[PDB]
């Protein structure tokens, strides 16, 4: 029941969270696990989120894909940095997760647009994504125009279809309780509370 | 299956997010319907987002409580800007929130904070919310003292714990498709795609 420090997995937080990953995965009344909310900003500070899918996690990071030209991607490639937040209602847990943003590298893209079904692949070269279009049919029109033009071809990544990876500063574990006491363990990259994990990581539990 | 502008429900954003929130609730496979990412960030440009709780929309926006002295809070308390996603996984939709954020009337805050159970309204008081403790014993035991304090009696609402408002400037729905064409209709507070709702209110179609 006690989300303690003592039990954990790891006192490396992207091993901690593979394991809470993992748990994510099995629990057949999560859809999908992999669901996270990016919330970005301008350099000013207007900040904005909305839902995306994490595409593969590792020492570098967490990545995750999108159209370079969308609101995201422009508040991205001017302030390159950004929050996660994983929340998996059904465990009652959540992960937050905060660092600068690296563009991935273009080949790698490459590699994994054409991995994506077909559908998807098309979809991403109709849709200038978070741009003004006057209806839906619209977009219905360009898209079985383009099925049409690449019939038994593969589709080109656009230029403004890529990757981010977010190196992590931050990762928080929330693991809430029936009593209030949420147990928040928080990993930072000393003083008599500050313990030390794996590398350069720093935890230290929050008040809820 | 279509979600249509000359379908919908209402040209107040406001009052579509009320029809979209309905459905939400009366949806058994949605646990919390009012489970929301709350997005903010330093006048800086550093975001941050945690989960919450919707407490109560209206015309004058979209209410929630905690801490002020939280990480959040002084966030808010130095750049009243923030985000909001509704996401319903079951109804494959989301909604996006933005706007300035008035911090709520005192006495509302007494009217609610006393609304809410014995124990969540001690467990505001033990709660320094995001400030580093030694181990999870301590706030139990603080928690169990203030039980005993707080016997036979009411619990003050602690100068901290109070609610904040944020006012819509721009909400935008977000209906997924099989197809990949997610039909994005946008609010915001003229063009030949930009079209007129009800008071100050103009809404256009995103591409997905
Ligand atoms: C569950 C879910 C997953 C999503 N995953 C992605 C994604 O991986 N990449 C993406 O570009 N948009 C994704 N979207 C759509 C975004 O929420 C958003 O509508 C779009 O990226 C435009 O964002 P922006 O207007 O902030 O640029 C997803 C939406 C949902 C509901
Ligand atoms: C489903 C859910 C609902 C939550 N609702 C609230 C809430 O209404 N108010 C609140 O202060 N924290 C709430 N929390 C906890 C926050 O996510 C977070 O841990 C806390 O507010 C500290 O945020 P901060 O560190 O950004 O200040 C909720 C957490 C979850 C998972």
Not at 43 to 59: C, I, T
Not at 63 to 82: H, M, Q, V
Not at 169 to 176: D, I, L, N, R
């Amino acid at each position: 029941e006690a989300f303690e420090e003592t039990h954990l997995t790891s006192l490396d937080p992207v091993k901690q969270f593979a394991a809470w990953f993992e748990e994510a995965v099995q629990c057949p009344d999560i859809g999908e696990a992999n669901a996270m909310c990016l919330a970005t900003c301008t350099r000013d500070g207007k900040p904005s989120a909305r839902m995306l899918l994490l595409k593969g996690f590792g020492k570098d990071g967490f990545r995750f894909f999108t159209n370079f030209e969308s609101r995201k991607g422009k508040e991205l490639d001017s302030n390159p940095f950004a929050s996660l937040v994983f929340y998996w209602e059904p465990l009652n847990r959540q992960v937050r997760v905060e660092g600068p943003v690296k563009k991935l590298p273009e080949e790698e893209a490459e590699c994994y647009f054409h991995s994506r079904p077909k559908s998807s692949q098309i979809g991403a070269v109709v849709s200038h994504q978070s741009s003004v279009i006057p209806d839906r049919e619209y977009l219905r029109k360009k898209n079985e125009e383009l099925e049409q033009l690449y019939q038994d071809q593969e589709v080109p990544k656009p230029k403004s279809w890529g990757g981010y990876v977010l190196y992590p500063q931050v990762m928080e574990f929330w693991q809430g309780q029936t009593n209030h006491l949420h147990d928040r363990i928080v990993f930072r990259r000393l003083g008599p509370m500050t313990h030390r994990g794996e590398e350069d990581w720093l935890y230290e539990r929050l008040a809820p």
